[model samples]
Target: GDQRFGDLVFRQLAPNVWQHTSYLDMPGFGAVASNGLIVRDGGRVLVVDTAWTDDQTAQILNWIKQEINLPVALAVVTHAHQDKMGGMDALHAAGIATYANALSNQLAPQEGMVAAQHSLTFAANGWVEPATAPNFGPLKVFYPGPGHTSDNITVGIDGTDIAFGGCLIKDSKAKSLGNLGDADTEHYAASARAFGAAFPKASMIVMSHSAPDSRAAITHTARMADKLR
Candidate 1:
């Protein structure tokens, strides 16, 4: 089943996870869609990334509250991009605790977005264990050495074979690398390879700018990134 709230649409991805897609009208790209996730755990819900704007983010929160009848425990922003954390104000205004990688917090302000309320520190190419933030449940934060941006991180849901690849991992149908303005072309291939190796069991990898796909999408992204090297 699918539910829509204006430009936002929610689709169930797993028994406990729902993918929410929102659109942003880029000057030259028309309306580009971005995906996020909402995970329900018991009576609490966890949100991954925000919608394109504050209004849309607010709608997400409302849907969880009114439709799902659960309070959002936390939200994890995957990167500092507008499609990921542009609605930081909305999350903050709702008094929902937000978390993001330390590098993402540092870069968020530079992108005109508020930093997450809490920051998790990890090595440049390392990860923070899923147990570290128990509130995030099985989601583990892994920084695969920057593909789309310097602060991008992949969130892998433990035991579920699902991972939120954000904008770092391209969709299976992408013909070329989408955005390179803040990309590390030299290291992008290595980053994608790292992501693939880290989540070899991932069956469904959710992306920001495209639909969710299998682990093969990660390999495809690595192949494309190799071209830039």
Candidate 2:
């Protein structure tokens, strides 16, 4: 981690978009923790992914309650991973709408190395599965062709230029591609193409992991993915 990056901080990316990044001091990998945002459109309020843990989720929730009486019309989890899907229960308990990739909901964990790895990974990173709750509010989801995961989905505001692209875009450095030793590298590249095609006109790309405020940021990721493979 670069000492020059300073500590974790939050910054607004647009009118209703915000970015949060954690400055981990880890070597060669100070990836920002998943961040949350409260996007409001008129009387509607949407909470993006819950970030990492309940503690983190609660802090964002606190901001929501304090800022506006706009009850959560929805809570969108950009993908199926624990980081995005884990904090659902808390929000569900509060009666917030919960959503995720359609393929993710259909995916089942089988016992074996993969299952063990996933379970352990959750515990190590603090995983808490939310209830099988239903989603509320107007929703639009488009799962990328099949790059990031067999079950990766991107959610965007129905009539707006914003899209929560999950881990599809990777990070700000726009490193073209990252394979967690889990993803099919080839498919991921193809998925990126499909993403760009579908969103040829998007003004911004809301990363599942980091916030890059411009469309150029999306290109930044494309370049990195290109460099990766």
Candidate 3:
């Protein structure tokens, strides 16, 4: 399922659902991969997180156009991290609408990254909370408190019971939490539990920089929380 397009490689998770990755080398992290989702919703494509850069994002757009013959309708930001929303400028140029919480919008720019052009802040829905269930067609955006980042969120594809955990959850083999520069270790477990509870039937849990549908992803992260506590 890996449709390797440029530095971007997309692996299918389900029919019309894919996990797209782009490689990058951060100064400290060395080699890293930014992960996101590409869902074919109706005649439009819904992106979960943008690629590491505008150019990387465009590669995915080009693939969508060439293979799916659909337009990129909307994108949802998982958090304020550069790896999460770094390609906002590109998305905006394509005229795709973007959404994220207030904390993400506020911290994103402070991190020296481009803030999303659109807002999915719970306040917009007349709700003031850490998490909001905003509808991006069939997907639900759920922020389960602060774990990876205060604004880190997950997208639940209802029919597929698939949850994109962004950086909130770690993959199976990680010995420690991947990145803590912007994380809340004290609240990581509870936040992750809440996210899993919200989508109890999810068969496939997709974490950033990992394969899809791995049971160890959640179990290992829960163990890390215990040790940290």
Candidate 4:
């Protein structure tokens, strides 16, 4: 069942997967919404990214416990941005281990950002480039190279063929690359190209902000990436 709270909405995308949407207040951008994923594997759940705040994250966790009847085993922040990992502390206090790539982990403190508890110093192996495991059903972490952020990655949910592009892939309606704070715009095209080639079968794609259900996301992002830099 789908759940809704003030500005948050939890929509199920598959039997085992749910998309949790929350917002961030950006002065010039106005209220921006972002999405995190919840993957339930039996009694255990794996959360990808945390909600906008600790309180919101707690509400999500509580809902998972009472409604889904499952406990969150872990969470992985795909990037170092606040929208991706802001509520990580809430997950930590609940004893849920959190993970991130080495680049993200390294950049976090350098950017004066607190990082995830566990840092994946090395990449993993699987169907896609640089995969991560413990194989929670379909979830696979793939490093498609960097675009929006130098350490950004994608989360693939198998069977469902859903790809959570984090901040790497842009929405279909995106006019330009949303953030270039730590981006390699020079290499954006190659990265986008690599990602598209890597996950050619990803029919459904979700971005960090806007158009979470856009089928044209990856292609649209690649085109913009080529034009952006």
- Candidate 1: list runs displaced more than 4 Å: 129-134
Judging by TM-score against the true structure, name the best candidate. Answer: 1
Kindly report which residue stretches of model 4 are placed more than 4 angstroms away from their true locations once superposed: 121-137
lDDT of 2 by residue, 1-229 (tens): 1111223345665565555443223357675466545676668677766645454555566556665567777776655565666555567667665665444544523301011111111111111222322342323455565556666656555456766667777655644455454455656666665666666667767775655456665556566555547
lDDT of 2 at 227: 50
Question: Which residue segments of model 3 deviate by more than 4 Å?
Answer: 123-135
By lDDT, the better pick of 1 and 3 is: 1
Relative to the unseen true structure, what is the C-alpha lDDT of residue 1 in candidate 2, on a scale of 0 to 100? 19
Report the lDDT tens digits of candidate 3 across residue range 1-229. 5778878888888887988898888887787987899898888889988888889988888888887879888888788877888888889999988877767888887887787766665543323343433446768777677898878888788678688888988887877887788888888898888778777788789988777756568777878876667
lDDT of 3 at 95: 92
Which stretches in model 2 have alpha-carbon errors above 4 Å? Answer: 1-10, 20-31, 108-139, 158-160, 223-229
Candidate 1 to truth, TM: 0.95
Between candidates 1 and 3, the one scoring higher on TM-score is: 1
Cα-based lDDT for every prediction:
0.86, 0.54, 0.80, 0.77
Q: Residue 45 lDDT in model 1?
A: 91
